[PDB]
């Protein structure tokens, strides 16, 4: 027990550290190297930002939550942290979605779309992602206690209240994960099937890496959210922790499946680390 806590804080802490370091490297490498400053990498920039926010704030506060056994910081910063976390995670997923769309359009109309698409459009789509994430999650999180008339959240624990009622739970969860993953998988299927063998094996390779990443990371919690919404004593806390962390690590593996999956990005990376 004396070495266990430090082991936990070391694993989780170092994980978060690797997250923020990696994404900082992405942003920095995109700003520093003009050659990779394409419109397709602006989405990677926004993604790196969201994953940075997740990497610094969500991971450490949830590490604290889990390592102490309860949430001491208070109801105000509880609602704040949860709002932030959900909004920026949803932002991350919407970013992945918008990347999927962009890649689809770049694939289908290979000569018209890349020229027709401008940076202003990219900024517009990014802003759309963040805004829609905020609207979908933030107002429902903080103002649920004001509407219900009580804060269902226990004094020691810090979860979201509206999951106590399934009607909103499903509606938000599918709009955050299920619908977006359906769209991503189907249009990526369009990409793979219509685009393309070295040229063709690789497409299925990258698409598979990306989709398997997104799924193995985001699916556990989203289905755990659906399980707990039916019965209260049904889900313990250890598996919950596992699910939450599994959701967090996506923001750690994002530079691998989008940035470092390309050849130049890593070569750029090396010089920053190699001074």
């Amino acid at each position, epitope marked *: 027990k004396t070495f266990e806590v430090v082991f936990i804080v070391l694993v989780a802490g170092s994980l978060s550290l690797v997250t923020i370091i990696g994404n900082i490297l992405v942003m920095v490498s995109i700003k520093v190297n003009r*050659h*990779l400053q*394409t*419109v*397709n*990498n602006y989405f990677l920039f926004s993604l790196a930002c969201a994953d940075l926010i997740i990497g610094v704030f969500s991971m450490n506060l949830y590490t604290l939550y889990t390592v102490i056994g309860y949430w001491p910081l208070g109801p105000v910063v509880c609602d704040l942290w949860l709002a932030l976390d959900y909004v920026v995670s949803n932002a991350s997923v919407m970013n992945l979605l918008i990347i999927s769309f962009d*890649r689809y359009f*770049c694939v289908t109309k*290979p*000569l*018209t779309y*890349p*020229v027709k698409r401008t940076t202003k459009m990219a900024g517009m789509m990014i802003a759309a992602a963040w805004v829609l994430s905020f609207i979908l999650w933030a107002p429902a999180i903080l103002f649920w206690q004001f509407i219900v008339g009580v804060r269902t959240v226990e004094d020691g624990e810090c979860y979201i209240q509206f999951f106590s009622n399934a009607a909103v739970t499903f509606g938000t969860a599918i709009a955050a994960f299920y619908l977006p993953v359906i769209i991503m998988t189907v249009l990526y299927w369009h990409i793979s099937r219509a685009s*393309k*063998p*070295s*040229r*063709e094996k*690789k*497409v299925t390779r*990258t698409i598979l890496a990306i989709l398997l990443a997104f799924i193995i990371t985001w699916a556990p919690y989203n289905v755990m959210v659906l399980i707990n919404t039916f019965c209260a004593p049904c889900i313990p806390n250890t598996v919950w922790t596992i699910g939450y962390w599994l959701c967090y690590i996506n923001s750690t593996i994002n530079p691998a499946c989008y940035a470092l999956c*390309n*050849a*130049t*990005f890593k*070569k750029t990376f090396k010089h920053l680390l190699m001074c």
Partner: nanobody
Amino acid sequence: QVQLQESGGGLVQAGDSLRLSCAASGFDFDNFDDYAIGWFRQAPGQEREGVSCIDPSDGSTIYADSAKGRFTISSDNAENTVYLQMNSLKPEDTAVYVCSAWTLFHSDEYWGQGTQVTVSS
């Protein structure tokens, strides 16, 4: 990184033909195979529209609706150099022709210097 230089730029009367060649320099790690290459013409004050594009690894040709039937594109995989031959040209095809290369999903995208092609009559 890599510079892409073009050739063949010159004068031609209506009905004649030309052969623009785009050569790409030596690249580190990335294989010429891993790059798809397209030709883009830029007319005075006009938007940089795409004429055609070729995937050397697959040999797949994708032409624009404007230059279909006249323009033919290929390459030499061993030489790492692409050739775009245009036939039966019009004075509407007076523009600066540049050579672009995009890695899949539009990372590592490159643009060249460009050569002038002016059609008389």
